[PDB]
């Protein structure tokens, strides 16, 4: 038993809810919140901008130090940093950005990072401003992640569509 509430169960291990991941994160304090990061950890908009804003820019400050030491992430890759006031840890995961021409097949590699964590609160990778089809992101998620993932979908219209079209 864990503290996530109001989720619909899609599979043995994948759950979904219409929620703001920032507000969901501040209430659950999950062990891991996933950020929809880019390779530079420049948290300007979308989920990342919103998560970073909720940390009063502390996420960005920590991220800039990470990049200065380690260089950029790979598309499909991840790093674990602090969760600040939102979670114990933040798993920054880089899904392909269709609006940059990145290969959608890397979406599976991106979701594989979730398997290193027993339980996660996450957005749909490559959705939103990253330009992928969220229905496809949810299919790849279900077919790739084996650990317990709680998906927060900000848009109520999208949430209902994802549920109604799920196979
Ligand atoms: O509806 C969804 O979950 C998908 C969208 C796609 C566009 C970017 N996204 C977001 N952008 C800015 N703030 C957000 N807070 C929660 N999600 C946020 C998520």
b/e sequence 117-146, b meaning 16+ C-beta within 10 Å? beebbbbbbbbbebbbebeebbbbbbebbe
Give 98 Cα–ligand 1 centroid separation in angstroms: 16
Locate the DSSP E strands across 37-88.
78-82
Which residues in 51-85 are b (16+ Cβ under 10 Å) and which e?
bbebbeeebbebbeebeeeeeebebbbbbebebbe
Distance CA 58, CA 85 (A): 9
Q: What is the resolution of this structure in A?
A: 1.0
> What single-letter DSSP state applies at residue 165?
T
Among candidate residues 83, 70, 3, the one with its CA nearest the CA of residue 39? 70
Q: Which two tokens stand for residue 52?
A: 């970073």
CA of residue 113 to ligand 1 center, whole Å: 20
- Please tell me the residue having the least CA distance from ligand 1 atom 9: 46
Distance 72 CA to ligand 1 centre (A): 23
User: Which of 27, 140, 129, 42 lies closest to 85 in space, CA to CA?
Assistant: 27
What residues does ligand 1 touch, defined as CB less than 6 Å away?
Answer: 20-21, 46-47, 50, 123, 127-129, 153-155, 158
Pocket test for ligand 1, best of 19, 46, 49 (most atoms within 8 A of CB): 46
* CATH architecture of the domain formed by 8-165: 3-Layer(aba) Sandwich (3.40)
DSSP H or E run through 117: none
Ligand 1 centroid distance, CA of 95 (Å): 14
Choosing from 21, 93, 128 the residue with most ligand 1 atoms within 8 A of its CB, the one to mutate for a pocket test is 128
């Amino acid at each position: 038993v864990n503290s996530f509430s109001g989720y619909l169960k899609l599979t043995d291990n994948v759950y979904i809810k219409n929620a703001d991941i920032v507000e969901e994160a501040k209430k659950v304090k999950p062990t891991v919140v996933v950020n929809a990061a880019n390779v530079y950890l420049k948290h300007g908009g979308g989920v990342a901008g919103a998560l970073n804003k909720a940390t009063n820019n502390a996420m960005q400050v920590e991220s800039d130090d990470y990049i200065a030491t380690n260089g950029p992430l790979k598309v499909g890759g991840s790093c674990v940093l602090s969760g600040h006031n939102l979670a114990k840890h933040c798993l920054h995961v880089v899904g392909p950005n269709v609006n940059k021409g990145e290969d959608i097949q890397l979406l599976k590699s991106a979701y594989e990072n979730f398997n290193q964590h027993e339980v996660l609160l996450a957005p749909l990778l490559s959705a939103g401003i990253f330009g992928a089809d969220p229905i496809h992101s949810l299919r790849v998620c279900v077919d790739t992640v084996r650990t317990n993932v709680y998906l927060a979908v900000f848009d109520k219209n999208l949430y209902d569509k994802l549920v109604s079209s799920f196979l």
